[PDB]
Amino acid sequence: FVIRGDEVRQIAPGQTGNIADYNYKLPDDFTGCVIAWNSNKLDSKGN
Amino acid sequence: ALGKLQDVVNHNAQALNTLVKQLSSKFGAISSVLNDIFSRLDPPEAEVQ
């Protein structure tokens, strides 16, 4: 999934967040790993 | 002379009183109130306490 960019803290499992609350929650074990990186010029250009 | 009988009553009462007292002990956690731990701390850190 995509993210705004400054809310990478919000997607931390077991911790609530406004973007998380409307969109995504994770279990808390959440056993799986989380990988992220900026994709500025790939998807930002006024989009 | 009934102290021996009384001692049994006191010992049980003293032991039971200690058990109730132990409930208020935080045992190293931030607080001894269960709901306080869950409410104040996030679920990851709350379970530790």
DSSP type of residue A15: -
Q: What is the resolution of this structure in A?
A: 3.2
**Least CA distance to B47: which residue of chain A?**
A28
C-alpha B46/C-alpha B36 separation (Å) is 9
Q: Which residues neighbour B32 within 8 Å (Cβ) at sequence distance 6 or greater? A: B23, B24, B25, B26
Nearest to A14 by CA among A3, A25, A2: A25
The position carrying tokens 């006191």 is B10
Kindly state whether B42 is in contact with chain A, defined as any CB-CB distance less than 8 angstroms.
yes
Whether B44 contacts chain A with CB within 8 A = yes
> Taking the alpha carbons of A39, A16, A9, A29 in that order, is the dihedral positive or negative?
negative
